[PDB]
Design a protein around this nucleic acid. Structure first.
Length: 67
RNA sequence: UUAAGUUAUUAAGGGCGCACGGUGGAUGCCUUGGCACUAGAAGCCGAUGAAGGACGUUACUAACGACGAUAUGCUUUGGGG
């Protein structure tokens, strides 16, 4: 993905962001209710969201390099 | 059967020697933090938030980094294995 995340159509990114945020919410919710036992997913979901915002920022800058 | 002389026999204490304590840094070490030389800057920012912080962020959490809700980091170019 993280290459062709840049190939996504700027609404797949938007829906992808909120799907990933619901996934992170469920993970944090079941870490507390103590049944997770694979705690490394939390970190990588965070970084995915980071990935997804970064490219969605830079489209914006290139969207105003022309205008 | 008398006059006389004398010593230990506790070492409570004293000096010597012995042997384990407490103590803390004499020896060696350190070189993590500066005296000074050379060179480079440029003294150094921002009304694009400038100037030190406060709260936070790790799967687990107690001070500095990141700076930061994209948070114990994100993308990209080049090194590197």
């Amino acid at each position: 993905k993280a290459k062709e995340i840049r190939d996504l159509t700027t609404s797949e990114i938007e829906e992808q962001i909120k799907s990933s945020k619901e996934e992170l919410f469920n993970l944090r919710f079941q870490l507390a209710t103590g049944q997770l036992e694979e705690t490394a997913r939390i970190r990588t979901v965070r970084k995915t969201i980071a990935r997804l915002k970064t490219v969605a920022r830079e489209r914006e800058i290139e969207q105003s390099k022309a205008n």
